[model samples]
Target: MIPSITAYSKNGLKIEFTFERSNTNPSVTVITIQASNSTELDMTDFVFQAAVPKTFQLQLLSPSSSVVPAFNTGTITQVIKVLNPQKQQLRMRIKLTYNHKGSAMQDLAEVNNFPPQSWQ
Candidate 1:
């Protein structure tokens, strides 16, 4: 989940856009990443701010393969793609979520592990 972004400077806090990855899909890839619009906000009313519409492109990489999503819309969603492998098929997905216009998002951790259905 991605919430608002805050930058620490010699001054104080400022508003920014924040995009964060919930988790990397599958259970194989090690690198995890998150992206955001930083200061992406739309002024709706005098009371509160609205989340800006920001699109993100995520890529997964290995020694000989890559997985990228075709289109990623909305605040957050899940994406899965498979790569070519002889022993085991590569499974990967991205967990995307959004926070309030001025809030920060926390990365959620996988709570449990399950055995792979097939290892071949």
Candidate 2:
């Protein structure tokens, strides 16, 4: 999987986080990388099985005429820890989102153990 974060310098620093999935054969759903509630920051609510490699992406939306705030774009490398297999299969306990300058939206703070991964 070749994951990259591209920031649009012309359009107020809007960014796109893309993961190129090559030779991917696992079944996936949109809810796989959904976000969960957090007091500190926005963290992914997904989990991954240990010894299994998967690819994902997050798009930072730009402010339109109708939308009030535009999102900043960048990619952040995160580490996934395998914990309590009987209780949870995949876990995204900690994550980091990059903060670009002139970003309209507030960059999410560090989040730990946000929620249970609903995607299998």
Candidate 3:
């Protein structure tokens, strides 16, 4: 297992990604979204989108919930499926989009810290 990757929102949300591999597919990696909020405003329209190199593919499953409740009271869970055909070092640009406190927000996160066992 790889250490979790996390990102923070300006208003008080933390999005963390944890990695797992498929039982039968060596090229498949399963990414889980564990999101928490520390502010009063709930995050709505929450989405996790990511991009990998041409040799790899990605898929986003339906999130457990669209809203992440505030005050660290709840978590919004999601699944991300990645196909590493060539199994090169894993790296990606992720975009997180959501609505909070009546405004739409967007942010980009850069991730290249994946451990070798996760993709190789």
Candidate 4:
């Protein structure tokens, strides 16, 4: 199973994010965004940013520049946004910025595949 972290909006929407080595290349990491909530919520306008580790380089592999959509419960997977790295392993800061109920919100998580402790 892949490791993941969760964040909630002030209005109760859940954003579950995760990452893993790219299936085609171990040096690349791809992020998966899964949005869920108890009820329907807006699935538009989200900014995804990552504070890459000094030892690694990061690159987005989808839309060039686009926000995330909704991925509520009972389903899984989405456009695999590749965060290409220059090496096999490195920890990085992942951030998600978005608007909910006309207010701005953000989520932060530290990620490393070496151990479960990587998530914070």
Best model number under TM-score: 3
Return the lDDT, model 4, position 7: 32
Alpha-carbon error at 24 in model 2, in Å?
14
Question: Model 4: runs farther than 4 Å from truth?
Answer: 1-20, 37-40, 63-89, 112-120
lDDT by residue for model 4 (12-111), tens? 4454657676668665556565554444545346665666656556565343233333334342233344444444354556666667656687778665
Window of ten residues with lowest summed lDDT in model 3: 2-11
Query: Per-residue lDDT of 1-120 in model 1, one digit per residue for the tens?
Result: 223222111111122223332345332222222222223342111111111112212233321111111122111111212222333332222222334354543232221121233111
Model 3's lDDT to the true fold? 0.83
Q: Score candidate 3 by TM-score against the native.
A: 0.89
- The C-alpha stretches of model 1 lying farther than 4 A from their native spots are 1-77, 84-97, 100-102, 108-115
CA lDDT of every candidate: 0.24, 0.26, 0.83, 0.51
Steric clash pairs (candidate 1): 3-105, 4-103, 16-39, 17-38, 17-39, 19-35, 19-36, 25-93
Candidates sorted on lDDT, descending: 3, 4, 2, 1
